[PDB]
Amino acid sequence: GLTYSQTMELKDSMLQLDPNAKTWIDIEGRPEDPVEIAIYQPNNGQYIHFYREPTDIKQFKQDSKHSHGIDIQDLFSVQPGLTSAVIESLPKNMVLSCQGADDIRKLLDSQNRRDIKLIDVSMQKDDARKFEDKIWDEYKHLCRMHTGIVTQKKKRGGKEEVTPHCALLDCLMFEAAVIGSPQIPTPRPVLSRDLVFRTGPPRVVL
Ligand SMILES: [Mn+2]
Ligand SMILES: [Zn+2]
User: Fold this and answer.
1) Is residue 206 in some structural domain?
2) Measuring CA to CA, how many Å separate 201 from each of 75, 117, 138?
3) Could you give the CA distance from residue 7 to residue 185 in angstroms, rounded to a whole number?
4) Which of 10, 11, 116, 166 has the most CB within a 10 Å radius?
């Protein structure tokens, strides 16, 4: 769970959110077992983005091969408890936009945030990712967790490799698709890296 100072820091960082501004949300993993969450306000650029270790390792391994490409080893060092803490601190009656609402609706309801409203933009699968390449080009540095090769079924037979799905870059490219250009205000993380990850190994003296 979060320490006391960390909970305060999280609640304070989150108060940077405009409670009435357009806000995207996207998650990777099952709603009962999410592993990556992003909440992003395009008009000011602010985003909340963090990770979570899965409880069902065998579903995680299928999901990793087939949407997000995250290695279970890279999640060992993430801070626990962030998912329920962030969701509890979201402004009351916030209205969030998403591409495909069914899973996020279950996650929010499971956390007793039925007051949060979802707008499902529900773009066609290809249209939603029109700017995928451009968004990864410009913003790949914002998330390094997607290291595995990802393959997905083709609706007409067989499988194909796709770019891994990242909850943060999905928000960014969905906004780009809505406005018709990758011209968005610069995205800026609201959460400190030390809140997202536990203290890692010391730097190596070179
Ligand atoms: Mn996604
Ligand atoms: Zn990511």
Assistant:
1) no
2) 15, 41, 29
3) 28
4) 166
Q: Resolution of this PDB entry, in A?
A: 1.8
- Residue 138 assigned as binding residue: no
Strands 46-51 and 117-120: unpaired
CA dihedral 71, 75, 77, 81 (to 10 degrees): 180
Q: Say which DSSP state 15 is in.
A: T
Sign for the CA dihedral angle at 127, 132, 133, 139 comes to positive
Whether residue 204 is contained in a domain is answered as no
Q: How far is the CA of 195 from the centre of ligand 1 (A)?
A: 22
Q: Which domain holds residue 3?
A: 1-199
CA of 186 to the centre of ligand 2 (A): 17
Please tell me whether 88 is known to bind a ligand. no
Q: Is residue 205 one of the residues assigned to a domain?
A: no
| 171 within domain boundaries | yes
- Cα(134) to centroid(ligand 2), Å: 16
End-to-end CA separation in angstroms for the chain = 35
Q: Is 33 annotated as a binding residue?
A: no
143 known ligand binder: yes
